[PDB]
Design a protein around this ligand. Sequence first.
Ligand SMILES: Cc1cc2nc3c(=O)[nH]c(=O)nc-3n(C[C@H](O)[C@H](O)[C@H](O)COP(=O)(O)OP(=O)(O)OC[C@H]3O[C@@H](n4cnc5c(N)ncnc54)[C@H](O)[C@@H]3O)c2cc1C
Ligand SMILES: Cc1cc2nc3c(=O)[nH]c(=O)nc-3n(C[C@H](O)[C@H](O)[C@H](O)COP(=O)(O)OP(=O)(O)OC[C@H]3O[C@@H](n4cnc5c(N)ncnc54)[C@H](O)[C@@H]3O)c2cc1C
Ligand SMILES: NC(=O)c1cccnc1
Ligand SMILES: NC(=O)c1cccnc1
Lengths: 425, 425
Amino acid sequence: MYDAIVVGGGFSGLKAARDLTNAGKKVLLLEGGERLGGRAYSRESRNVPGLRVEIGGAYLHRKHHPRLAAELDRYGIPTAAASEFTSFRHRLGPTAVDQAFPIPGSEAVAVEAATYTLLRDAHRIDLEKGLENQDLEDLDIPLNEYVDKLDLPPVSRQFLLAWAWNMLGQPADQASALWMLQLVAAHHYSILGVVLSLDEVFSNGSADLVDAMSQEIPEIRLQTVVTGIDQSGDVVNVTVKDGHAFQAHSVIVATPMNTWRRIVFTPALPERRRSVIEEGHGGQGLKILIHVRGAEAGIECVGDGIFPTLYDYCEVSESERLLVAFTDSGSFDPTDIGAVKDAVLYYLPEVEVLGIDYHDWIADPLFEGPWVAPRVGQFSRVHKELGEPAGRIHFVGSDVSLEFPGYIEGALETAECAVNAILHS
Amino acid sequence: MYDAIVVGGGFSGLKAARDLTNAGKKVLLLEGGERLGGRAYSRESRNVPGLRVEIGGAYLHRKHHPRLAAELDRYGIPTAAASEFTSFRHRLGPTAVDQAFPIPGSEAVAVEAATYTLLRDAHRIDLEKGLENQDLEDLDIPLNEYVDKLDLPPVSRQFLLAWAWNMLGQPADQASALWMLQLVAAHHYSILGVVLSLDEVFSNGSADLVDAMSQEIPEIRLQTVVTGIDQSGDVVNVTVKDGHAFQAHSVIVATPMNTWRRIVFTPALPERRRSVIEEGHGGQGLKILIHVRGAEAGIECVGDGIFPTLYDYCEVSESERLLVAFTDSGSFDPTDIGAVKDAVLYYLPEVEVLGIDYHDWIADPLFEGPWVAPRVGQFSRVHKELGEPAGRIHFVGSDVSLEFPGYIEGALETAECAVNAILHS
Ligand SMILES: Cc1cc2nc3c(=O)[nH]c(=O)nc-3n(C[C@H](O)[C@H](O)[C@H](O)COP(=O)(O)OP(=O)(O)OC[C@H]3O[C@@H](n4cnc5c(N)ncnc54)[C@H](O)[C@@H]3O)c2cc1C
Ligand SMILES: Cc1cc2nc3c(=O)[nH]c(=O)nc-3n(C[C@H](O)[C@H](O)[C@H](O)COP(=O)(O)OP(=O)(O)OC[C@H]3O[C@@H](n4cnc5c(N)ncnc54)[C@H](O)[C@@H]3O)c2cc1C
Ligand SMILES: NC(=O)c1cccnc1
Ligand SMILES: NC(=O)c1cccnc1
């Protein structure tokens, strides 16, 4: 038996397991899959033999992600400032302007007014209290209705919608307007910052940092799927698909939120948390890497397409590249290459699709979902609590961060606080 | 004797005198000078024989100035959309960009945040209550300190300051930050709108509308300076520099605010109003028409010069134009043509000054000031009341508008309410 069992080896689990270990605890780390990193997946392209692609979470911004910045600085991990955009091909109607910020002057007075409204509403949210504890229900409505109340003229209406589609991974009518605001608050009460935090990338991918952190964890078991976590006894008992149980004083659940319903907890979890855990969160972000000929470097496209955003990802050859599309999985079928062609040609009619590459996070039983985004109504009923301790069992990870939900910095933050919790118990 | 005496024949006096007359009152209009229009002065250029220039208030914007729009529509007065700007020559440092909106992206996140602060503060002001009745003292401080608290990066700091200098007619340390906000509220809670209301001009100058309105006033006396307004008796007694008094049930003071201290009121005015009336308001706007060779059409310059703004006014010849500078009278001496050359060359080094043209509103005893702007501290002590009736004597005009101070629309608004007041008495 162990001081702690860390269940899940994404960034959250890895930090906790490392920090407890360095603090002198006897820690075991249990990972269901055959790799470490979780939703930070860097592998080789399915399209381009020999090329390494980020299939999940890639970007960072130091001023917003100090914890991540410290990890990179600790292990000397190189980051490069992300591909600049020299070329704009929006689908925002004829009055829009082909630059990074495509709102035209004719819309400025409306943008000014909406900027005040968006920021006033976001200033409502205090990021330490939980979205259920601040009388924020009037905000917890479908985003399409929220944006309809703002009454924005065409370019900015659709610019806001397209980036809200990309970032939330939900179509406008499934997204919570209050979650959109939670992101604005996360970024220092900035709308712009939600998009400008696409600031840096790992020169050699997330795997660098995954490896540096795991180097410092002495006991890791891959292919070890947890199926029950039982704290009826004096000492927590962790049960597993094929194998002898493991036992520890503390357990940290560092697995996706949408997977918790596949573990048997004993006793059953506090009763507030239970419907949300069953239904899961609404996140459906679909990120597609598209292999293309005919595209020049630097293209960014935002607009009303089934891909709200489509932009450069990297150079493949002198005539070939990868672009990246965002849309959501219950709106687009990534295996319908003709669909993909139509979505792309919509913005970029000169460009031939050579192939596509994605991960079905939803279909993956180790995840059942990409990054968190609540269903309308969920997080103003229960939110802070989904990541509070239940007995000797802690809950951590991006999904349950109040400070940064959906980003690595969130995975790292939630583990700080759990590690600290345990160190005092 | 008359139902009403209207004292002053700027736009405020002219509307009142006309509306009372049309309502069937026996009205006399008394004007101290030799022309009608007041601070709306259109005469011939001192520089360009035969050319008609606006020396005072020229611009309008229909959506913000419905009363003005109705006057223009009533008399079929043509307006032309004001000279467009094709050419930018700012002095905002090396990171600024030569277009109408010169803030660079590097400053966007700061602009966003200040936009929220500026608009939150302006939303504090409710335009019907008066600036002294809303607990707004924390705002009634020097603008330089306010803008220092906002902590803006160079381009936008100086862009805001330069336009606040132009619009308020005061250097930053003499201007009330709360007045700056009053203007933002006046324009529908818009910062941008304060500058975008430079939208239209009178094709043939303000005089058109001055003449249409005066056509409908049957009794006007020019060169008739009022020196005492005495309402001790049953009927108000109006005394005059050289001449027999005039008498009326009602008197409307439609003269500048900074002139009221040159009239003897009986009884003396309510005691709150009296210090402000003595000291006067702080407005020192100085608008200079500059006759130039070497300038092309379309130039707008904003920057840190002794002229915060310098831009095209109109074509004189194919090689000659007028520009317009704004600055303030206690900072620049318009008769120092070398000073003017330096101020201009600062922004426009290729341009030769041929001459200048201005009106000393301050030195003019019929005005003693250009448009209103309070001294720091004044309008959060007394404001609404300066334009409330004192006995049978009413007070109207741009200076005392809560809705639009410094614009014609304000002169027109304050006269509506006085005319209505009288019609019910
Ligand atoms: C498409 C996409 C793009 C993204 N882009 C960014 C970005 O640009 N910047 C950024 O900061 N973040 C980004 N992210 C979000 C971020 O990468 C993740 O939210 C973050 O890595 C979450 O890590 P975690 O440690 O909380 O959980 P995860 O990384 O998901 O780790 C959970 C671990 O638990 C394991 N597991 C699951 N079930 C069991 C079981 N029962 N027993 C044992 N182990 C189990 C899984 O195999 C996994 O290793 C992106 C995410 C996605 C999906
Ligand atoms: C440089 C400058 C630029 C401007 N630009 C604009 C603009 O772009 N758009 C806009 O809407 N407004 C503008 N204005 C402001 C606007 O023109 C004035 O505030 C407005 O016309 C005020 O009119 P009024 O009727 O309130 O007073 P005034 O027009 O000033 O009229 C007062 C009248 O009283 C007379 N008078 C004074 N003393 C006596 C006396 N004791 N007895 C009898 N008569 C007396 C004066 O001769 C005058 O006719 C500008 C003003 C200035 C100074
Ligand atoms: N939570 C988010 O909005 C998010 C994070 C990373 C990538 N895309 C979206
Ligand atoms: N009150 C004002 O700011 C004003 C009005 C007209 C011209 N300049 C300034």
